[PDB]
Paper text:
β 2m is a single-domain protein, characterized by a seven-stranded β -sandwich fold typical of the immunoglobulin domain family; β -strands within the protein are named from A to G. β 2m is the light chain of the major histocompatibility complex (MHC) class I121314. While β 2m is highly stabilized by the interactions within the MHC class I15, when β 2m is released as a monomer, it may turn into the etiological agent of dialysis-related amyloidosis, a condition triggered by renal impairment and the subsequent chronic accumulation of abnormally high concentrations of β 2m in body fluids. The introduction in the DE loop of a residue endowed with higher conformational freedom, such as Gly, relieves the local conformational strain and results in a β 2m variant thermodynamically more stable in solution, with a decreased aggregation propensity.
In particular, for the crystal structures here reported of the W60G-Y63W and V85E mutants a closed AB loop conformation was observed; by contrast, the wild-type β 2m, W60G and W60G-N83V 3D structures exhibit an open AB loop conformation. Residue 63 lies in the E strand, in close vicinity of the DE loop (residues 57–60). The Y63W mutation triggers just a minor reorientation of the DE loop backbone, but is responsible of extensive, though local, side chain reorganization. Conversely, introduction of the Y63W and N83V mutations (added to the W60G mutation) did not vary significantly the Tm value recorded for the W60G mutant.
Numbering used by the authors: 0 to 98
The structure:
């Protein structure tokens, strides 16, 4: 058996501007086993519809997921990614930051 803690990156496809559509990405990678729970949060609340999920095993046997959705940032909305995995003692929250 192998277990490996996910790497978690949260970033937009383009630099952000209010009014302009964009995409918010969670790239969760290098983990094992493949069982995992990954949510995008908007103002602390789970985003139900996350349009896209690209995912696979890597050559090294670990797993990766790109979890993303269209979003239009505003001044006052904060976003984060919440991940749970057997390697984590509690859920891991990674905030989105622009820059």
């Amino acid at each position: 058996m192998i277990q490996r803690t996910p790497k978690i990156q949260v970033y937009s496809r383009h630099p952000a501007e209010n009014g302009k559509s964009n995409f918010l990405n969670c790239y969760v990678s290098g983990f094992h086993p493949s069982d995992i729970e990954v949510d995008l949060l908007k103002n602390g609340e789970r985003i139900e519809k996350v349009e896209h999920s690209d995912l696979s095993f890597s050559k090294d046997g670990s797993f990766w997921l790109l979890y993303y959705t269209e979003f239009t940032p505003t001044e006052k909305d904060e976003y984060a990614c919440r991940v749970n995995h057997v390697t984590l003692s509690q859920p891991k929250i990674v905030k989105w930051d622009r820059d």
